[PDB]
């Protein structure tokens, strides 16, 4: 999803924290494969 | 003799084995940070 740069809106970002607001999703982390992927993900998220 | 040595190679295995610790530790540290940085280069360029 495109943030992209703003500034919009209110406190000139007003959110701007933003560790996926809470994650890294820090899997173990220990998993550097990265798959060369993909669309990003149509996945029915495009249908969403 | 041996002695092996004359302190200064027994006690410069305090050099030699520990210069080997500076070297093996140097490859250890550069291995670590270099490996994780390049991991944060496929992160940082590919990903």
Curated annotation (Swiss-Prot), chain A:
Compartment annotation: Cytoplasm; Cell membrane
TM regions (residue ranges): none
Top-level taxon of the source organism: Eukaryota
Subunit structure: The exocyst complex is composed of SEC3, SEC5, SEC6, SEC8, SEC10, SEC15, EXO70 and EXO84.
Family: Belongs to the SEC8 family.
Function per UniProt: Component of the exocyst complex involved in the docking of exocytic vesicles with fusion sites on the plasma membrane.
Name the UniProt record assigns to this protein: Exocyst complex component SEC8
Organism: Saccharomyces cerevisiae (strain ATCC 204508 / S288c) (Baker's yeast)
Upper lineage: Eukaryota, Fungi, Dikarya, Ascomycota, Saccharomycotina
Gene: SEC8
Residue window of the full protein shown: 776 to 823 of 1065
From Swiss-Prot, chain B:
Domain of life: Eukaryota
UniProt subunit comment: The exocyst complex is composed of SEC3, SEC5, SEC6, SEC8, SEC10, SEC15, EXO70 and EXO84.
Other comment: Present with 3400 molecules/cell in log phase SD medium.
Family: Belongs to the SEC5 family.
Function according to Swiss-Prot or TrEMBL: Component of the exocyst complex involved in the docking of exocytic vesicles with fusion sites on the plasma membrane.
Name assigned to this protein: Exocyst complex component SEC5
Gene name per UniProt: SEC5
